[PDB]
Assembly symmetry: C3
Homo-oligomer: 148 residues x 3
């Protein structure tokens, strides 16, 4: 019922965090996202929203997260609204990204993004999937490292 | 049923975190809290518990969170006990508060509070609301900034 | 039903975090864990998996967490699979451990572990309990303090 849908939608955010933090950009994205996927990270990158093939998104994530020794996404505070086979989710996110020493040198090594997801999900034949991801940053620390 | 109540009570903590972190002290508190509201932040401020009108609480939050460039509340680990139209919730909280550079100068800029909420909720005609908030700190970093 | 089981299993992780962070190693472990308990912290300590009496585990936790002024475990992203009276849970964890000043001196004072739990639970006559805990670290900061 509705509570099973809610619980499955919340769990998708655990799997979403696992994509990045386990660096598993091949199988897991198919279990988490629709194809194509709408993405909006403009609040952090200045790149406007786009709708992209899932394999492109995965390849892009693999390339960018390859810059980090590790990451940790702590996603909390899910506010889920369901209407049959669609849902919206607002959540908190705290995302830590550590640069290797070879890049960070004697300086800061951790890029922090805090803020919110305002995402959409759809109920597919293979279960709920996140069809749109939008990240709004409230604060960043060491954002220059995302460039460095 | 009971599981819908639990899920709605947990979601209230997402909305609670949103009050502070989106700095929305006017509408959201009515959706999250009863009027009046009992508050106990004594473990952090030394001010004893009080029961206050909700508009006072909102105005006070607006004034105090106005000192921060941003905040992030990560609330996790909800332990919810429900008895008809009342509930208790114990949870973990990690609350980050960043001071603007104009105030922090060359020193630390982030006030960290970790610890627990031990809160009460009531089922109102318009849904669950948090009727009592109690924060017990296990640790703080840079607490002097909450004064500065 | 299944959703009550899921919610109870997720709540166990709140109580698990409370063992360490409230430093309550006597009563709470009986409410959270089976006796005996399988533990695997090898990814952090190099000690291989073992199955130990619960009172030994509690005594060991009391001794080790006695080194810290405070800790905070933020457990998020639960992915729960249930099969009757057994479950597996994968989750994110961010665990902070602060050393007292008397030990940290003028140096770093916070040991950070980020990574994952990959745990098992069993439905006992007194409710769900965590029967196996496995922590896999993705990153640590100041791990030398866990020794110091």
């Amino acid at each position: 019922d509705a509570e099973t849908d809610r619980a499955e939608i919340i769990e998708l955010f655990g799997r979403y965090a696992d994509i990045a933090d386990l660096k598993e950009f091949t199988d897991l994205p198919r279990r988490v996202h629709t194809d194509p996927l709408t993405i909006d990270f403009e609040s952090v990158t200045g790149m406007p929203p786009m709708t992209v093939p899932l394999s492109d998104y995965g390849a892009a994530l693999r390339a960018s997260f390859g810059a980090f020794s590790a990451t940790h996404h702590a996603i909390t505070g899910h506010v889920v609204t369901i209407d049959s086979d669609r849902a919206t989710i607002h959540a908190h996110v705290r995302a830590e990204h550590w640069l290797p020493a070879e890049v960070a040198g004697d300086g800061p090594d951790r890029w922090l993004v805090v803020g919110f997801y305002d995402n959409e999900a759809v109920r597919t034949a293979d279960g709920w999937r996140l069809s749109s991801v939008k990240l709004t940053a409230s604060y960043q620390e060491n954002a220059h490292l995302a460039r460095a």
